[PDB]
Amino acid sequence: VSFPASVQLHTAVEMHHWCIPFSVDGQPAPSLRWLFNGSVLNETSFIFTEFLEPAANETVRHGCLRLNQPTHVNNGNYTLLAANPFGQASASIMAAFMDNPFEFN
């Protein structure tokens, strides 16, 4: 069972944590939904919505659709849809996180 403490460090590396910045306003507070290339994007533990802190001033809410482990499969068009009783809005953005994989001939 019992033995001495051992430890090991490696070369520091930058992760590929990305953020698609967004702002959302409306009262009552709207609901959000994302689309990836036109279809519902279901949030996982590696792709999820995250809000920044509320200013104390405005009604807006700022945040990120965070992507912690993106690869070329995640390259595409992203849309955020918001809706409240008084109206519905949408905004598109194209994003690329990694080049497309090399293919031989």
Swiss-Prot record:
Carbohydrate-modified residues: 37, 42, 57, 77
Domain of life: Eukaryota
Induction: Isoform TrkA-III is up-regulated upon hypoxia in cells normally expressing it.
Tissue: Isoform TrkA-I is found in most non-neuronal tissues. Isoform TrkA-II is primarily expressed in neuronal cells. TrkA-III is specifically expressed by pluripotent neural stem and neural crest progenitors.
Localization per Swiss-Prot or TrEMBL: Cell membrane; Early endosome membrane; Late endosome membrane; Recycling endosome membrane
PTM characteristics: Ligand-mediated autophosphorylation. Interaction with SQSTM1 is phosphotyrosine-dependent. N-glycosylated. Isoform TrkA-I and isoform TrkA-II are N-glycosylated.
Domain Ig-like C2-type intervals: 18-84
Additional comment: Trk also stands for tropomyosin-related kinase since it was first isolated as an oncogenic protein which was the result of a fusion between the tropomyosin gene TPM3 and NTRK1.
Disease tied to this protein: Congenital insensitivity to pain with anhidrosis: Characterized by a congenital insensitivity to pain, anhidrosis (absence of sweating), absence of reaction to noxious stimuli, self-mutilating behavior, and intellectual disability. This rare autosomal recessive disorder is also known as congenital sensory neuropathy with anhidrosis or hereditary sensory and autonomic neuropathy type IV or familial dysautonomia type II.
Function: Receptor tyrosine kinase involved in the development and the maturation of the central and peripheral nervous systems through regulation of proliferation, differentiation and survival of sympathetic and nervous neurons. High affinity receptor for NGF which is its primary ligand. Can also bind and be activated by NTF3/neurotrophin-3. However, NTF3 only supports axonal extension through NTRK1 but has no effect on neuron survival. Upon dimeric NGF ligand-binding, undergoes homodimerization, autophosphorylation and activation.
Family membership noted in the UniProt record: Belongs to the protein kinase superfamily. Tyr protein kinase family. Insulin receptor subfamily.
Notes concerning its domains: The transmembrane domain mediates interaction with KIDINS220.
Record-given protein name: High affinity nerve growth factor receptor
Organism: Homo sapiens
Upper classification of the organism: Eukaryota, Metazoa, Chordata, Craniata, Vertebrata
GN (gene name): NTRK1
